[PDB]
Amino acid sequence: VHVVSRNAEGVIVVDGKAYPMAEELVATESVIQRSIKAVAKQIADFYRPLSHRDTHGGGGVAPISDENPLIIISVLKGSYIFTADMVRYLGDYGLPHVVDFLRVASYNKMQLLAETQFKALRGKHVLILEDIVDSGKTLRYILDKVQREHQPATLKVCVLADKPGGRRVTMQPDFVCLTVPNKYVIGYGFEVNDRFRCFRHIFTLRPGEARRYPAHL
């Protein structure tokens, strides 16, 4: 169980630990984990009965199985902790799956930083695991690229977080674990220059803290 309060300095404390960079708590670890496990059950219920291209028996179509698993593409770096937890819940619900990774970045225009290494996704069910949908530009770019380069049977998106008010392009993920306020979030994979990703809870960031670490790593 968690205790969420503010100390005498007005700083958020969760389970005895102070978070002076946080404006508000969004979700505790318990709430996050319950939300991910609930979505894992939805993903397993949706994909378990489906069939797709048989690459194990070089055959036609066959059920999702350890021979022909659901293909999961995890988006680095923000989704790796979420992915590690989600795959264990998907295993709990008995969904056969395998995970590869891609990474994208913006210069705002989008560019691939790291490509997936899976090469046989034609006619396969593919699920993207991503940390958050905000404007929707990052996921529109990933979906268009995976669709044209891999030609999957179906392509869906599961996000840990949906920031509804940030949308600038049409993008509604098929699966959403949590809804967050229209603010910059940190914790549980969410970072400020790679800091704060290890927090077990999600918080909104005090606006003055966003440029605290300007030096490139």
- Tell me the closest approach of the beta carbon of residue 197 to ligand IMU, in angstroms: 9
CB atoms within 10 A of CB 153: 16
Of 167 and 195, which has the nearer Cβ to a second copy? 195
Interface region with a second copy, contact rule CB under 8 A, candidates 80-88, 140-148, 160-168, 174-182? 80-88
Cα 189 from Cα 199, distance rounded (Å): 8
The residue from 85, 131, 134, 162 that is catalytic is 134
- For residue 119, give the DSSP letter: -
Interface region with a second copy, contact rule CB under 8 A, candidates 44-52, 73-81, 129-137, 157-165? 73-81
- For residue 65, give the DSSP letter: S
What x/- string results for residues 121 through 140 when contact with ligand IMU is judged by CB under 6 A?
A: ----------xxxxxxxx--
- Tell me the closest approach of the beta carbon of residue 63 to ligand IMU, in angstroms: 25
Cα 104 from Cα 187, distance rounded (Å): 20
Q: Counting runs of H as helices and runs of E as strands, what totals does the chain give? A: 3, 14
Q: Cis omega (within 30 of 0) on the bond before 77?
A: yes
* Structure tokens that stand for 96 in this block: 């056969």
Catalytic amino acids? 134
Contacts to a second copy by CB under 8 A? 55-56, 58, 66-67, 69, 71, 76-77, 80-81, 83-85, 87-88, 90-91, 96-101, 103, 105, 113-114, 117-120, 193-195, 197-200, 212-213, 215-217
